[PDB]
Design a protein around this ligand. Structure first.
Ligand SMILES: CCCCCCCCCCCCCCCCCC(=O)OC[C@H](CO[C@@H]1O[C@H](CO[C@H]2O[C@H](CO)[C@H](O)[C@H](O)[C@H]2O)[C@H](O)[C@H](O)[C@H]1O)OC(=O)CCCCCCCCCCCCCCCCC
Ligand SMILES: CCCCCCCCCCCCCCCCCC(=O)OC[C@H](CO[C@@H]1O[C@H](CO[C@H]2O[C@H](CO)[C@H](O)[C@H](O)[C@H]2O)[C@H](O)[C@H](O)[C@H]1O)OC(=O)CCCCCCCCCCCCCCCCC
Ligand code: CLA
Ligand code: CLA
Ligand code: CLA
Ligand SMILES: CCCCCCCCCCCCCCCC(=O)OC[C@H](COP(=O)(O)OC[C@@H](O)CO)OC(=O)CCCCCCCCCCCCCCC
Ligand SMILES: CCCCCCCCCCCCCCCC(=O)OC[C@H](COP(=O)(O)OC[C@@H](O)CO)OC(=O)CCCCCCCCCCCCCCC
Ligand SMILES: CCCCCCCCCCCCCCCC(=O)OC[C@H](COP(=O)(O)OC[C@@H](O)CO)OC(=O)CCCCCCCCCCCCCCC
Ligand code: HEM
Ligand SMILES: CCCCCCCCCCCCO[C@@H]1O[C@H](CO)[C@@H](O[C@H]2O[C@H](CO)[C@@H](O)[C@H](O)[C@H]2O)[C@H](O)[C@H]1O
Ligand SMILES: CCCCCCCCCCCCO[C@@H]1O[C@H](CO)[C@@H](O[C@H]2O[C@H](CO)[C@@H](O)[C@H](O)[C@H]2O)[C@H](O)[C@H]1O
Ligand SMILES: CCCCCCCS[C@@H]1O[C@H](CO)[C@@H](O)[C@H](O)[C@H]1O
Ligand SMILES: CCCCCCCS[C@@H]1O[C@H](CO)[C@@H](O)[C@H](O)[C@H]1O
Ligand code: OEX
Ligand SMILES: [Ca+2]
Ligand SMILES: [Ca+2]
Ligand SMILES: [Cl-]
Ligand SMILES: [Cl-]
Ligand SMILES: [Fe+2]
Lengths: 30, 37, 334, 97, 151, 112, 34, 171, 137, 243, 34
């Protein structure tokens, strides 16, 4: 369970990288 | 990018929330004994 | 345009979501290989005989480690500085026992990060920017080189290079203190001035700019909305911030020039960390911290301890205990 | 039932004197004239059923025999302990200063 | 000299206390120095046979000049403090010594490093100046403003 | 239950006192001195040059009060075990089974 | 008693995950205009 | 420092680790922000030395936030786009780091340490072949304590005979 | 505490005669010992054979006795194993082997006496540190 | 005539010398002459480990393993007395040499088996009436297998036999008994058995080569667990000499 | 390994409760009239 937990949190973080980068709110000049 | 014309807003009214929470909580009250076994 | 021309145009295109570029051409596969090998090893690699004495150390999650204790374990002392790729092993099982993953990971990573630096130059060039962000990046990079490549070269083995793990990092630090008295080394001290100072000036700058933000918002909204991306006007009053800081100390201790100030902000931690890297890189050839052991002596000749001698006692504990089955002769000469 | 054989041996004469059958060779530096020549001979020709048997080492000079006789009181013999005599540990037992 | 059979002496880890094999089989010195088996030197090579360190040569052929040389080199290892206290970092003051190898290697690593940095600096700058934006971005001709957004 | 007060003696019948663990130390050596603080026995790390082992010094432990009252132990393992416990002060019997206790000190409500 | 050791997390997630789904839906409904 | 390693295993403490992240992250932000500003400067003068091309009273940004944003977006994947947020963040990271480290030291005041992982110790006690960098470092700590305590804590009058000092082979 | 004439009074020979060294002799002794000997004997131990140290008790149980000036001067001319059985000039610095241990070439009788005096006096100052090794640092 | 620079890094250094296929002669034994083995070499080619069945009444087999400690396995430069016995048999008494190697092999599924591959104190004899060593000569004998770790070896929690803690210091108030086997280190010393089958003989140089099979226990981690049974197979070379 | 049995539910709630807090706030922000 420990190992599963550690790897799961890591995996969520990597997925979060993906969304933060490719699905960020686009910067818009004013 | 052209916006997608198929999008639709989603709703859950308060009564549905109360019903849903009742369903979940009562299901949990029922199945928890079997989860602990 | 021909296929190769098109390809070059794509590689060096300024419109890719992530810039590729020619450095990127090397960076992407090497970083991918280092990353993949690192993740698989950290989860599932068997115990590794780091010190070449048939005493395998467990680094992976599946073999009894948590996030804090786990590591990819440095290659065997038996290997020393020999090149140990997968095809040098008789089998993947041998490869794993001897710490092959470590070498694959740190070589692919050192190459990939070097190319990361180059790529920072490259994109600065494509965008019409000035070129020296990559020079700032050279400081952490040099440090990585120091602990993964240079120190092993100097000591004659990748088994003394820093472990890829949290507790392994602490292991590296403590043995380093035992063997070099790094704390008493002025380059490490400049490194500490570098990161303590970097932290200090980070907080200072942040607080000064935040303190002089021009009112553009109501109290029910975040002041951040008072800045709009790409507005030409500065978002804070630097004269007010300078008035403040200049009065906090005295006027001529404060920067009125923003360029001068931001240059300071870049130079202090970068130079400090350059010296940290050089400190590791030169203790790599055993030019060590100051040794004032038994430096104060009374009229008869009795030793009068200083704080340096207490440090020396701690270092001795580290020395005599580290790698407890690896030494057969009285001097630890590497 | 489990015993540390070295601790146990410390409760025998081995813990009181130089054991001709087990003790590491550096111990012969304790007394005048034993190290290194006699010490090497003694460890070499071990084990011994009794202390005085050390006198029967072939090739011993009369001086050597006298020195040994003078130091019998500081010697003992006990059963050979495998743990103390394997690994060439009688010549180097991993201890320096 | 004390009578040890150094070829058969098993150390605490199970590897030879004095002598062991390299990963390709050559006979080499044991202990931590197993890392250094690629070393070659005039005082050691007479003991080297086709399979590495030769046990018969070790038993019968070691000369006093070799003992001397090994003792000298062992007691002048390139380890020492910045104020030139010779030896390991825990050693007491007494011997004024830092190896010339240490001085030369450290000095030239430092210089080579700052020279790499200088190369990055002046290369980046030479590119920027040749292209003509080494002094900064032209406000009225800011290149990114003519590029399509990333998203 | 209290096991009773452990009194340690050497072969010469001198009373020896176990040096107590200070709070700073997660682990602590086992050293026994006479009433003047002169070292008389210990549990050695390296054995090869031991001078003070319980075996060599003939250390015994006799208990007074508590459950072991009036009893005396002379076998080195037992004596050593009790010396080990004596670094924590008075010696007690514990039920470690009921709670699956792991043998590692925890703080009290004062601490928390 | 000797209960199943995953019973606790199982019950907690059984409650929390769909409850939270519902709460998200409800709140974003309230926050819509009109 | 060394006392805290040997006696408290302070490096193992997650509050100290958060401290380290805040200080090293603060240093990183200092460096990267200063360098980014200096390398997205507008040409506001004719000098090749560009410091003089600034006026404290000027109304314009002296560097390009838009270029900076595209650069870091394409290099690192993400970038600041808001200056106010940027500088608040620069306040937040090192300040928070130091506060966390403080909490940890408050724990060490009571020897309320993050010294051990109990599961580690149960396994290692039962299994003499189980070794991790965590157990390695405790051996180092035990060395530090035994070898430094008698001179570092003279009021205790420690006399640790040679035979009880923890030492590995040879050293 | 001071470096007194009494501290500097050491056995000249085996027959109970002493010699009182001057402070200049003590300093010369430390200098020369550092010059020709400390590379192996720093702090009174012996790096290339830690079993033998320079403690006075150890030197007294040596053969011939080495816990006096004459014994140490002789040792520096014609060193032997601990039992006196082998002459080891070929692997140990000495006047006899000044040809292969060149730092011994410029050492005078006076120098040998000073080194000897250093070896005898220093344990009187440092106690167990002398010959103690790292344990006593 | 290869030099060290010819051989270094090739793996040849871990290999015993071979004899040409022509070496099928006889090496005469003069019963009035004393003899020596100037060099005995043993190059292991396979390490088999006896699986440990669950019913304890099944026929346990020796299964193959993967060597993971590389070309560090051979015994070499071994020498000793070669006695001519009353009944015409020869007995080799091992005196010294590089006569042990720590070896770790891995079983299918990942279990690692360290052993001290050795012929320490080998005493091995032929059949009676060996007037010449031939391709029919064989040696059979026994040797000692000391603990794989020697007495100073410290486990990861710093416990050892001739040095180290004598308890689990990280568990200050745990009950001792359950931990006794781990806390009290023991030094094993067992017997192994070996056969040498001579396959080639140069009767002119007195060189012999052949195959060997040895059997011995593996590492018991200073008494913490049971050893495994190991069968080692490989080739050997010996040079016989009048002494 | 003899880990703490509450560690799993502890980690799970430690992640889920505040994460869910943030997701709720975000979603009801998106649904507000643009
Ligand atoms: C906020 C701002 C940030 C500040 C961060 C601080 C970072 C820098 C800190 C530097 C502190 C320097 C303190 C000097 C202490 C001193 O008194 O130092 C004393 C030493 C000499 O020490 C003596 O060294 C002796 C050596 O003994 C040996 O040698 C003796 C004879 O020489 C005997 O033979 C003896 O037996 C033998 O053991 C003994 O130990 C003496 O007791 C001992 O006092 O000076 C020497 O070593 C001289 C050579 C080394 C000098 C190096 C100085 C620092 C170099 C890098 C600085 C930055 C570079 C930037 C460039 C751009
Ligand atoms: C705080 C104050 C400092 C503030 C910052 C200022 C920036 C520069 C700082 C420099 C230090 C100022 C004082 C220097 C005094 C000094 O050094 O005094 C020291 C000596 C003179 O002192 C003599 O120093 C000697 C040094 O030992 C040398 O000589 C011995 C005896 O012959 C031995 O041979 C030994 O092996 C050998 O190293 C001995 O100790 C003598 O007893 C002693 O009198 O000056 C020398 O050597 C000359 C040194 C020349 C430059 C060094 C070249 C090599 C540098 C390598 C860099 C690599 C990385 C370094 C990391 C740091
Ligand atoms: C960007 C692409 C790239 C690069 C540069 C590397 C580099 C490396 N790999 Mg990796 N690898 C990659 C992609 C890459 N890899 C991919 C996609 C995979 C999956 C298929 C792998 C799978 C892999 C494995 C399994 C292993 C490696 C290993 C290695 C290391 C040894 C390689 C070697 O011996 O080649 C030598 C080849 C040459 C020298 C030929 C090139 C000669 C050119 C044409 C001219 C000379 C160039 C000169 C020397 C330097 C250039 C100067 C410059 C200024 C232009 C080296 C760090 C090994 C390792 O890490 O060992 C520890 C290892 O075991 N790689
Ligand atoms: C290749 C360069 C080099 C090397 C390897 C040596 C090595 C040595 N010198 Mg020599 N020497 C040198 C250049 C060098 N020197 C120079 C340039 C001078 C004129 C100053 C001298 C004049 C000199 C004298 C008078 C003496 C020596 C002595 C020695 C010996 C003792 C050194 C010592 O204690 O240093 C002490 C260590 C320091 C002072 C530390 C220096 C750290 C520097 C300042 C850091 C610089 C970093 C970087 C360059 C800064 C860039 C800034 C960044 C922001 C970009 C040692 C063998 C001594 C000796 O034994 O002679 C027989 C001696 O008496 N040297
Ligand atoms: C990667 C390496 C690394 C990093 C980045 C850190 C970072 C930190 N360590 Mg850690 N440390 C490390 C490794 C590291 N450590 C290791 C391996 C150990 C061994 C276990 C330690 C042991 C350790 C201990 C024992 C302590 C730290 C503490 C800290 C924090 C100190 C913050 C500070 O600036 O205090 C500096 C002091 C202040 C900011 C107080 C105010 C200072 C005033 C304003 C100064 C005014 C001066 C005045 C003007 C006069 C100057 C005159 C001049 C002549 C001197 C910081 C988070 C400290 C901590 O956690 O505190 C809560 C602490 O006590 N560390
Ligand atoms: C793999 C991981 C998967 C995790 C995600 C799981 C999420 C699943 C969420 C399911 C919850 C559904 C709740 C809907 C709750 C809900 O929205 O109800 C009200 C809803 C009314 O729908 P309307 O069409 O009126 O639309 C109104 C909208 O606001 C609803 O979106 O009716 C239904 O949804 C049909 C089924 C109702 C069933 C309700 C019965 C409850 C009765 C009480 C039972 C307990 C008492 C028993 C006593 C003995
Ligand atoms: C000339 C001395 C150079 C010393 C080493 C390099 C220092 C500067 C490198 C920091 C890189 C930061 C990342 C990019 C930051 C960046 O982009 O920089 C930009 C900044 C301004 O650039 P400009 O284009 O206006 O001027 C540089 C050239 O184009 C010539 O005008 O560069 C400088 O100020 C040059 C400073 C030269 C003088 C610096 C001396 C400072 C150090 C003195 C030694 C202290 C040692 C203390 C030890 C105790
Ligand atoms: C070639 C590609 C190389 C890079 C690939 C991977 C890069 C991943 C970068 C981080 C993505 C996640 C960002 C989430 C958050 C996110 O999307 O932020 C986006 C944010 C955008 O800021 P703005 O100025 O646009 O925000 C303005 C307003 O929205 C404020 O309310 O950027 C920052 O705030 C910078 C400071 C945080 C930087 C945090 C970096 C942390 C690095 C990772 C550390 C944890 C690693 C754990 C290892 C197990
Ligand atoms: C310097 C000139 C020097 C002196 C003086 C010196 C003295 C010395 C003595 C008195 C002994 C005997 C110690 C005893 O009986 O307890 C002794 C022994 C050894 N030494 Fe020495 N020594 C001097 C120089 C050196 C140097 C430079 C070395 C290292 C190369 C060295 C080493 C040794 C060794 C080894 C021994 C033990 C010899 C043996 O008995 O087999 N010495 N020294
Ligand atoms: C998030 C992605 C998830 C995919 C990754 C899955 C990794 C596999 C984890 C397996 C769990 C480990 O299971 C381990 O097995 C042995 C044998 O039963 C147990 O031993 C009892 C251990 O206590 C247990 O921790
Ligand atoms: C661990 C358990 C986790 C469970 C996770 C469950 C996640 C559920 C996701 C809910 C997604 C809601 O999706 C959200 O819908 C609303 C409408 O309802 C959209 O809102 C859109 O329409 C409404 C119309 O009323 C407009 O006012 C709003 O301006 C517009 O953006 C949001 O743009 C969208 O983000
Ligand atoms: C050979 C040992 C016999 C003496 C018993 C050990 C000292 S006392 C012993 O210590 C345990 C904690 O370790 C307690 O749990 C137990 O209650 C107590 O009997
Ligand atoms: C996607 C690849 C994941 C990595 C595969 C892990 C190695 S494979 C793994 O090895 C263990 C030890 O040999 C075996 O016990 C186990 O049965 C086997 O599945
Ligand atoms: O491997 Mn890691 O650590 Ca650098 O010293 Mn030597 O070797 Mn080992 O001992 Mn100390
Ligand atoms: Ca239990
Ligand atoms: Ca045959
Ligand atoms: Cl270690
Ligand atoms: Cl070693
Ligand atoms: Fe700024």
């Amino acid at each position: 369970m420990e190992t599963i937990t550690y790897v799961f949190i890591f995996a969520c973080i990597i997925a979060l990288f993906f969304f933060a980068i490719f699905f960020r709110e686009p910067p818009r000049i004013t | 990018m052209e916006p997608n014309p198929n999008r639709q807003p989603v709703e859950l009214n308060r009564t549905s929330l109360y019903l849903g929470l009742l369903l979940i909580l009562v299901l949990a009250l029922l199945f928890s004994s079997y989860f602990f076994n | 345009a021909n296929l190769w021309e098109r390809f070059c145009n794509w590689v060096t295109s300024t419109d890719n979501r992530l810039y590729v570029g020619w450095f990127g051409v090397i960076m992407i596969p090497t970083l991918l290989a280092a990353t993949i090998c690192f993740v698989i090893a950290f989860i599932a690699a068997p115990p590794v005989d780091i010190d070449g004495i048939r005493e395998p150390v467990s680094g992976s999650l599946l073999y009894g480690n948590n996030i804090i204790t786990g590591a990819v374990v440095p290659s065997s002392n038996a290997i020393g500085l020999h090149f140990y790729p997968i095809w040098e092993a008789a089998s993947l099982d041998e490869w794993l026992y001897n710490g092959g993953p470590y070498q694959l990971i740190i070589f692919h990573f050192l190459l990939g990060a070097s190319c990361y630096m180059g790529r920072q130059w490259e994109l600065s060039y494509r965008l019409g920017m000035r070129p020296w962000i990559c020079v700032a990046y050279s400081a952490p990079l040099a440090s990585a080189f120091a602990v993964f490549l240079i120190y092993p070269i100097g000591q004659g083995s990748f088994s003394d290079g820093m472990p890829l793990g949290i507790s392994g990092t602490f292991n590296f630090m403590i043995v380093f203190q035992a063997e070099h008295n790094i704390l008493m080394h002025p380059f490490h001290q400049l490194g500490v001035a570098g990161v303590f100072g970097g932290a200090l000036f980070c907080a200072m700058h942040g607080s000064l700019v935040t303190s002089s933000l021009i009112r553009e918002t109501t109290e029910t909204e975040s002041a951040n909305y008072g800045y709009k991306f790409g507005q030409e006007e500065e978002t804070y009053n630097i004269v007010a911030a300078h008035g403040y800081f200049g009065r906090l100390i005295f006027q001529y201790a404060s920067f009125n020039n923003s360029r001068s100030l931001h240059f300071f902000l870049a130079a202090w931690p970068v130079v400090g960390v350059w010296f940290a890297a050089l400190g590791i890189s030169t203790m790599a050839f055993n030019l060590n911290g100051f040794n004032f052991n038994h430096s104060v002596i009374d009229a008869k000749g009795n030793v009068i301890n200083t704080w340096a001698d207490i440090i020396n006692r701690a270092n001795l504990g580290m020395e005599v205990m580290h790698e407890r089955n690896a030494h057969n002769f009285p001097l630890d000469l590497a | 039932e489990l015993v540390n054989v070295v601790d146990e041996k410390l409760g025998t004469a081995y813990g009181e004197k130089i054991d001709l059958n087990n003790t590491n060779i550096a111990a012969f530096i304790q007394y005048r004239g034993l190290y290194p020549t006699l010490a090497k001979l003694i460890v070499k020709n071990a084990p011994y059923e009794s202390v005085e048997d050390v006198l029967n080492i072939p090739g011993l000079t009369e001086r050597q025999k006298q020195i040994l006789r003078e130091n019998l009181e500081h010697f003992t013999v006990t059963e050979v302990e495998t743990a103390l005599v394997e690994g060439g540990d009688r010549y180097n037992n991993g201890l320096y200063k | 000299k004390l009578g040890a059979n150094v070829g058969s002496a098993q150390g605490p880890t199970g590897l030879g206390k004095y002598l062991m094999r390299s990963p390709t089989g050559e006979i080499i010195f044991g202990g931590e120095t197993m890392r250094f088996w690629d070393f070659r030197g005039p005082w050691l090579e007479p003991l080297r046979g086709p399979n590495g360190l030769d046990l018969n040569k070790i038993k019968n052929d070691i000369q006093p000049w070799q003992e001397r040389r090994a003792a000298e080199y062992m007691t002048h290892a390139p380890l020492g403090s910045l104020n030139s206290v010779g030896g390991v970092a825990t050693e007491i003051n007494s011997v004024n010594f830092v190896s010339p190898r240490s001085w030369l290697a450290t000095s030239h690593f430092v210089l080579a490093f700052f020279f790499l940095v200088g190369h990055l600096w002046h290369a980046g700058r030479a590119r920027a100046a040749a292209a003509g934006f080494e002094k900064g971005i032209d406000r009225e001709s800011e290149p990114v403003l003519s590029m399509p957004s990333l998203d | 239950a209290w096991k009773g007060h452990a009194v340690f003696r050497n072969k010469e019948g001198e009373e020896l006192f176990v040096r107590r663990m200070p709070a700073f130390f997660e682990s602590f050596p086992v050293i026994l001195t006479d009433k003047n603080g002169v070292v008389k026995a210990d549990i050695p790390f390296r054995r090869a040059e031991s001078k003070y082992s319980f075996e060599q010094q003939g250390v015994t432990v006799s208990f007074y009060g508590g459950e072991l009252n009036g009893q005396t132990f002379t076998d080195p393992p037992t004596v050593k075990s009790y010396a080990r416990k004596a670094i924590f002060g008075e010696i007690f019997e514990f039920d470690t089974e009921t709670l699956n206790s792991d043998g590692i000190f925890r703080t009290s409500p004062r601490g928390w | 008693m000797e209960v199943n050791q995953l019973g606790l997390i199982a019950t907690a997630l059984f409650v929390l995950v769909p409850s939270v789904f519902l709460i998200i839906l409800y709140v974003q409904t309230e926050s819509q205009q009109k | 420092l060394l006392f805290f390693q040997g006696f408290h295993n302070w490096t193992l403490n997650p509050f100290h680790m958060m401290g380290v992240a805040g200080v090293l992250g603060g240093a990183l932000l200092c460096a990267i922000h200063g360098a980014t500003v200096e390398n997205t400067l507008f040409q506001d003068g004719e000098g090749a030395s560009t410091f003089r091309a600034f006026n404290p009273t000027q109304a314009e940004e002296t560097y390009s936030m838009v270029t900076a944003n595209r650069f870091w977006s394409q290099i690192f994947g993400i970038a600041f786009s808001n200056k106010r947020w940027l500088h608040f963040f620069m306040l937040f990271v090192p300040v928070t780091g130091l506060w966390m480290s403080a909490i940890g030291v408050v724990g060490l005041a009571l020897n309320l340490r993050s010294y051990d992982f109990i599961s580690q110790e149960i396994r290692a006690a039962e299994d003499p072949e189980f070794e991790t960098f965590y157990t390695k470092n405790l051996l180092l700590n035990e060395g530090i304590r035994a070898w430094m305590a008698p001179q570092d804590q003279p009021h205790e009058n420690f006399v640790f005979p040679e035979e009880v000092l923890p030492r590995g082979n040879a050293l | 505490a001071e470096l007194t004439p009494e501290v500097l009074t050491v056995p000249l020979n085996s027959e109970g005669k002493t010699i009182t060294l001057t402070e200049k002799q003590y300093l010369e002794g430390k200098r020369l010992f550092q010059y020709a000997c400390a590379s192996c004997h720093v702090g009174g131990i012996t790096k290339t054979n830690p079993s033998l140290d320079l403690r006075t008790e150890t030197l007294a149980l040596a053969t011939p006795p080495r816990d006096n000036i004459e014994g140490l001067v002789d040792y520096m001319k014609n060193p032997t194993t601990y039992d006196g059985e082998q002459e080891i000039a070929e692997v140990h610095p000495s006047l006899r082997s000044a040809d292969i241990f060149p730092k011994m070439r410029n050492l005078t009788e006076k120098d040998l006496v000073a080194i000897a005096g250093h070896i005898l006096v220093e344990p009187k100052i440092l106690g167990d540190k002398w010959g103690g090794g790292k344990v006593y640092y | 005539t290869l030099t060290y620079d010819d051989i270094v890094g090739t793996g040849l250094a871990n290999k015993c010398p071979t004899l040409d296929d022509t070496a099928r002669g006889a090496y005469p034994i003069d019963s009035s002459q004393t003899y020596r083995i100037a060099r005995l070499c043993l190059q292991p080619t396979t390490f088999l480990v006896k699986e440990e069945p669950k019913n304890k009444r099944q026929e346990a087999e020796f299964v193959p393993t993967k060597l993971v400690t590389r070309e560090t396995t051979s015994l070499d430069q071994i020498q000793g007395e070669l006695k001519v016995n009353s009944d015409g048999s020869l007995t080799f008494v091992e005196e010294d040499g590089i006569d042990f190697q720590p070896v770790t092999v891995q079983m299918a599924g990942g279990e690692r088996i360290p052993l001290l591959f050795t012929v320490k104190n080998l005493v091995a004899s032929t059949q009676p009436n060996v007037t010449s060593i031939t391709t029919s000569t064989d040696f059979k004998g026994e040797f000692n297998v000391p603990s794989y770790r020697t007495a100073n070896f410290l486990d990861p929690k710093g416990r050892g036999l001739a040095s180290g803690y004598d308890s689990a210091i990280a568990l200050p108030q745990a009950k001792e008994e359950e931990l006794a086997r781990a806390n009290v280190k023991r030094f094993s010393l067992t017997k192994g058995q070996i056969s040498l089958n001579v396959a080639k003989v140069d009767g002119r140089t007195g060189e012999i080569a052949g195959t060997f099979e040895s059997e011995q226990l593996s590492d018991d981690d200073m008494g913490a667990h049971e050893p495994h049974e190991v069968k080692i197979q490989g080739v050997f070379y010996a040079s016989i000499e009048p002494a």
